[PDB]
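Re: your question from the hallway

Yes, I did run it. Sequences:
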Amino acid sequence: ATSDDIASIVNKPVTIYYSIGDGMQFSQWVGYQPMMILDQLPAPVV
Amino acid sequence: NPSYQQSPRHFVPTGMHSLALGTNLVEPLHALRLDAAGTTQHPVGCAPDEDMTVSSIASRYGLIRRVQWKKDHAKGSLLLQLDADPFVEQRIEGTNPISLYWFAPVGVVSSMFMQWRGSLEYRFDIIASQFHTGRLIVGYVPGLTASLQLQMDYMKLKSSSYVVFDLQESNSFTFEVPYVSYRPWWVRKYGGNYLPSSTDAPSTLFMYVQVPLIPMEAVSDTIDINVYVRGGSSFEVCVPVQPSLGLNWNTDFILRNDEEYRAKTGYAPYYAGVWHSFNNSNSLVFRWGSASDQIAQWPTISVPRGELAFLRIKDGKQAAVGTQPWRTMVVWPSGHGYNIGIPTYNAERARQLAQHLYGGGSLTDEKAKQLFVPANQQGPGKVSNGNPVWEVMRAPL
Amino acid sequence: NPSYQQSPRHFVPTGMHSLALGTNLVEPLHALRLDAAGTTQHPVGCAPDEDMTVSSIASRYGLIRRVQWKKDHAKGSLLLQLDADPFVEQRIEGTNPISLYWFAPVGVVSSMFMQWRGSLEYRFDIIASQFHTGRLIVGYVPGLTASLQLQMDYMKLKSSSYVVFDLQESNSFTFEVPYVSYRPWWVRKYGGNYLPSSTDAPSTLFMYVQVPLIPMEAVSDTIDINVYVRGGSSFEVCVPVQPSLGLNWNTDFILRNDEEYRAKTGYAPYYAGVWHSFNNSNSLVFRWGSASDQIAQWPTISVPRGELAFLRIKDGKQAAVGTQPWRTMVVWPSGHGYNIGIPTYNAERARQLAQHLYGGGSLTDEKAKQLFVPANQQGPGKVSNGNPVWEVMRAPL
Amino acid sequence: NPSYQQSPRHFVPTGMHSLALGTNLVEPLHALRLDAAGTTQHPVGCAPDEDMTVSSIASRYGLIRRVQWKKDHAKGSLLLQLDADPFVEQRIEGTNPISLYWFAPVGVVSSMFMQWRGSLEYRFDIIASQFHTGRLIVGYVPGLTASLQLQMDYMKLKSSSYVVFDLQESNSFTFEVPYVSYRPWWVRKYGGNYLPSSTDAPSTLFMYVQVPLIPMEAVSDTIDINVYVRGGSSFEVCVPVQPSLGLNWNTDFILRNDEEYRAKTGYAPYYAGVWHSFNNSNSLVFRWGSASDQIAQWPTISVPRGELAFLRIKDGKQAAVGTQPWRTMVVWPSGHGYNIGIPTYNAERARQLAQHLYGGGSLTDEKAKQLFVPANQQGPGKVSNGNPVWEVMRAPL
Amino acid sequence: NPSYQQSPRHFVPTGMHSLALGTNLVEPLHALRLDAAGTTQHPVGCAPDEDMTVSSIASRYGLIRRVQWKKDHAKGSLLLQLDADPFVEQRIEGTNPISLYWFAPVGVVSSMFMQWRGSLEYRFDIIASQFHTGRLIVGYVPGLTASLQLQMDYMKLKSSSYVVFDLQESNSFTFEVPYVSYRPWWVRKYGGNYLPSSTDAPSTLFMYVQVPLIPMEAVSDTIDINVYVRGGSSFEVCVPVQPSLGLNWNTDFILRNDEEYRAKTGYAPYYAGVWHSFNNSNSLVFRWGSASDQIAQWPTISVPRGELAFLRIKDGKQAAVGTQPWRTMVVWPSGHGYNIGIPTYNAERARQLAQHLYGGGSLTDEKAKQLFVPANQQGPGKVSNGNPVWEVMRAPL
Amino acid sequence: DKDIDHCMFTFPCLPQGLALDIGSAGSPHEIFNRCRDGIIPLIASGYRFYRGDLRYKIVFPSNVNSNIWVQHRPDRRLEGWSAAKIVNCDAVSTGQGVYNHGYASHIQITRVNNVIELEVPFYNATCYNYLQAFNASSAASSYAVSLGEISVGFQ
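Structure:
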């Protein structure tokens, strides 16, 4: 798009996805780093 | 060129290949690979050492607990009572509001699944000299509700399945926790940030000091004991859902308190600008964009009657900057069904303007327009840094 | 999940399966039938008695004519000279402007086709007692133009192919009309309402009284004769086009005389309404719709100079009704490139308004606006019944 | 109803089947034929006599030339020197600016192709009595540029390939022109109306009177000779492009001189109309359409400073007609980035208006609006006939 | 016509066939070729002499260097130390800011690839008479960083792999550079104009005069030596990326300095025009187009407070021309969220206007409008030549 | 004011690549200004001749709906390395500026899709064409470069 048209595109969302595409291969095992529990996350609070 | 007079096929278009699917399914793509049929290949020295697999991970002990076990402990004394679920915890002393936690690998991998079943295993390592001697139950009570989580002793524990052990020569063993539930599987303990639908563990482990330790004088009374969780051979999960866990890589979070005020989503960054519908662009007004009618829209302040309010940014640095940074603002309805934000020179002009508008005076009124900031002040027309918080400067009218 | 890297197919979309096709062609559909492969089935008692087929119909006599044949007829006397085409006529005494007509089935089925060829057949039934005796030619002249349609006699007829017949014992027979044309087929006699491209019949039948009837005194001098058309065995048609015929089921028609005036197509029903561009909706104007700028548009009246005109509906019942039915109207250009219709209280206000506008006065003028009907009069805002005819009330100015 | 979970195909749509292709290629269509698999069939009496084919045409002589050959001609005398290309000419005495030309069929068929190659043939018919006797070279010089086209004689011609012939008994023969070029094919001599890319013939034919005619006194000194071009057996073309020729069926052409003035393309027919942005439709302005803002747009006249101009149609008959035909007009910018055409009563009102606008006066000015033609004058609102030429009535200001 | 009731296919559309792919992949097209299955064919005399291939090119020496080798050189003396990478350089004395460079073909072909590996080859041609005699190391040090690029001598060089050579009879040879890196491949030395991600060569070649030349008195002391790079047999590249090189065919470049001012992209060419929102088109304003609201938009000048500025084109020839070329302009906000450019008669009117607008005065003000150029001045309405640079005429206010 | 007949623009169709267009100093085409040349021409640099075809796959602007036609004109000779480039045809004079009959052509429907995928056949009465930048010399030599001349026009 040219700059005259490009304005329509402003602040438009662009999601991106991904997955490993079959050929992917992880290698060496490593233990996990410490986790953070999700339902333990704070409420937005009124 | 024979005509192909025969009837055309009759499908239904859809815009996207399935996401959730990921098995016996060729998945068409626009490869950026040059070769039409090329594929990543693993050099024999680069061969995949690890066959990633649920069981392959689940079959790995992680340290989960570190009981201290002193000589003086009573024969009835409990050591621990962690739940019979993969999701055993190990809190770290994270000073962060979101404390981190160690997990056995099995718990982590379990966290990605709604349901799970099968036995677990707890290797116990009684780090002790041979001369130390003792004995302890490690029982397992099926079906304890938390109210019944108490009332326990080793003796009631004996009513259910349990295993006594004698520390003397060999100083370690491995208990194997039974899977016992009305349910063929078992729902995840936690879930995505969503407290309901977080069923607790079917049953609970216990471990009491069945015979108090009897150390020689030449060796320490205390004895460290370590507990290693691991998925049992029977262990397995099924349904994939949102993991209930997050990496420590970015332990950051943002509360959505409403107390702070700022521009509506999709309307930032905004800049002091001009707009023909507003004072014929003779006065500045925030715009999230350059094309006409890209005025920044603003949430409606709840001003109790007899008062007034006007915005004042909590950060001058994030303020959109015309000839001056615009730290002060008065939000008022566009008359087009939304609330524009009007930059002001100061908290005072904004105040007086609020005295006007909440005084029921119109934007059209000279009292307002004099308080309106003239288009010439737009200067560079710098955008606001992101969507900066605006303090709500309420005042009585 | 192998990637399917191979190139995608490359068609051309079209929105619809072919219509004209109807043979060796599977025709995909959204069946409302529940079963995926279900199909209508005919119970053995419901079996299709009739194999519908062009020949199957064509091989059926229909009465087409009823000659009277009196004793006194001269040996030269003609009885009939109907054309050698399937499209033989039999007018009914329909008082309707569109008179109906009987047809032999063969003519009807022929009417659906541009072209036809092959022999025809005329069974003749001389409803007569055996005692009656007579003789008559039924000849066939190829290639008669209508100018040559006359000049005929049985004798010139004899120059071409013909068949004499002797009424005595057997009182009926069947002539078989030859197909003789330069053209392998033959164009339809008529066509869809479209006079050109309506070629006449190749040739014409005749029947003269070769020997005058000689009845006994004890039997009637007149003898009814009936003529039955039917497709010959050779008979056949080919190209399918618009039938040149209509069912009697709805012998109704509408002339498109232009003399009557009414709203442009797609602009009815219309209702007295309001429109911001017109007097700021302070006065009524016909709208074919509710959404803004759905003003009914109107054809331009041709008013000769020095005059004026204003509409007045020929039916008050069909008038759109505000507070009052709007039987009177003045059409004037919108100034937006079309002619709005403006409701008026009466033929007079409309007149005065015409005196104004054709007086060159503007709609904007007070003289007009006073004549404009105020928005309050819209009342129910009832739509006009369909697109009612408006009488054009012309007056000199 | 099993679900079809497998991945969908992944094409690329395109809107149209290929045009240029026309061979081993099934070409899908919406046949209007009734039968799904029906096809035109040729009756044995209607059988295609002609196998249309490039060679099939190329192998046909056409008369191309008519040399006169008098007795008195010198032995050196030339008869003709037409080029060794299929595109031999035969001008007709068309009085038309576009003179017509005869062509040998081979030249015509050649005209459709960019390239060609192979031998040609020139049958020569020396229409002469046996008693006439003579002799003549018909040589062929490869590679003549036009500068070298001259300097020729039969003798230099002899340096290259040539054929002597002796007119005595047999009075006709057939020379066969060689194909000799650096290029395997040969570019077309002409092309679509596009002078560059019109390479001339590789080589040139000649024919000189090698021995002057020696007629008997009892027979004429002059002898008609005719020349018949035809594609040689070797002859062939390849690449299909725009034919460089046109049928005589419609020898009509239109120069695009710019001197005449008329409405922009797509803006005709136009009619005097009204337009709310123009004088609030209180005055007429040309519209190419009825829907709002379908104002006819007009090319900008180049008026040198200190002057003015106004349009006046060269044909009153083609003028759009309001209450009057609008033979006079003033084009001025819309102020919306295009030039509207404003109808005027006369060349004078248009003049005065030009005196105004080129006087720098605005359309808004009363001087203009008085000259503007009032909406009432729109009358029938007849469209202009097509896009009639407007004379530019320039005047000094 | 059976109905095809079965379920329709269920794809996913995409607008384009893959680009990056180019191998085992049929690639559908709209051939402009006439034949459906036709293909370019190579005449046996036109047969492809060259099997284009990476190795086929890489296996070609190019001269890369021309060492002079005088008699007097010390035995320790270096001759060259070019890097052990395909991207060896040979600068030309291009006076152009972008100096050109010779490359060995192998370097060029290498430039198209991110990665490469394998041996190289340096033929050495010691252009010398047999009587000249000498000796020289051509060693190879793996793994030199540039800091270690110095400190070198032939002797340290000897610590790594090297080859001594004796110039006497045969006067030329070919060293073969080893590929030695931790990395199986090796990243490109340069890249597209993008300095980071431009890793240097793994290792470096050297060549010292191991034994100083000992020429006879009857022959020259200096000896030319030439160095020819070529891809080794082992040599190969892999990943295709943007070549880091450009043809000399058009050694032209354009710096994007911001100092010059001109219209926003997509808004040129622009012409003095009129616009109803601007002074009701009563005054000229630049338009990049004719349709309404195709006003040329302009970048915001950064005028420090207390000043003013106005544009003045650096080229009158490129100026859009109304009645006059418009060499002077004042850019001001549209009030519609963008900056229009307003043509002025001169730098002065533009100045005064700046005195106004930067004086905070409005466009609406008479002081401005008097300075506005009237629509009549639009004249031809010639467009600006491209997007000409505008000088920024700043002045204090 | 282009008539429907008019080609919107034209260009020679040659492997070598068009003469590089940095664009104006006012409006640089950064990709050539910066990402100089490109691969295919770069390899074309290594050879003096070529024979064969070309693919193109033009991409039209999306916003427009209008149907789009594309002529191929082999007939046109390229002339000098100058004007080995895109050209915007203007007022009709010759048949050059308009749609033409015999030439092969194809029409994309933007509303269906805004990207045509062309294939250009080799058509020359030559063994094979020049491959380096072409200064011309022989008048015949002018035909001996570009496969022809593609042209495009909106309806």
